[PDB]
Design a protein around this ligand. Structure first.
Ligand SMILES: CCOC(=O)Nc1cc(-c2ccc(C)c(NS(C)(=O)=O)c2)nn2c(C)nnc12
Length: 110
């Protein structure tokens, strides 16, 4: 891990931590469209993403740089904003978790 990717790994640890679990847990595993009845989910969302996938990629040392890590995390959030109306509970949860991500990601030394 580069120093930037070590920083990203620490961010991932925080996003997965009990501190944020009350709004992070819908992002812990891939959206299960069949169980939830999200009929059009895989038509609307071309590239699903979630924290278990980010965690797998980081653990396997698959990210080439910090930008690749950030793109996945933002893809996860953007999918949630794209699929859901603005007043849905899960959009508010996404925003609270993204507050954590964007602030800590911005503090990455460069
Ligand atoms: C028409 C109503 O729209 C929605 O219900 N939307 C969304 C719902 C949930 C969601 C809820 C409850 C549970 C138990 C789960 N679990 S999981 C990760 O296995 O699928 C997920 N996540 N979500 C994400 C991300 N993005 N959108 C949604």
């Amino acid at each position: 891990l580069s120093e930037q990717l070590k920083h990203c790994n620490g961010i991932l640890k925080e996003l997965l931590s009990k501190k944020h679990a009350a709004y992070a847990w819908p992002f812990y595993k891939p959206v299960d469209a069949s169980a939830l009845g999200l009929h059009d989910y895989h038509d609307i969302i071309k590239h699903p993403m979630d924290l278990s996938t980010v965690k797998r990629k980081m653990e396997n040392r698959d990210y080439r740089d910090a930008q690749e890590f950030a793109a996945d995390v933002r893809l996860m959030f953007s999918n949630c904003y794209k699929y859901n109306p603005p007043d849905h509970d899960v959009v508010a949860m996404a925003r609270k978790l993204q507050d954590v991500f964007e602030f800590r990601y911005a503090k990455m030394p460069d």
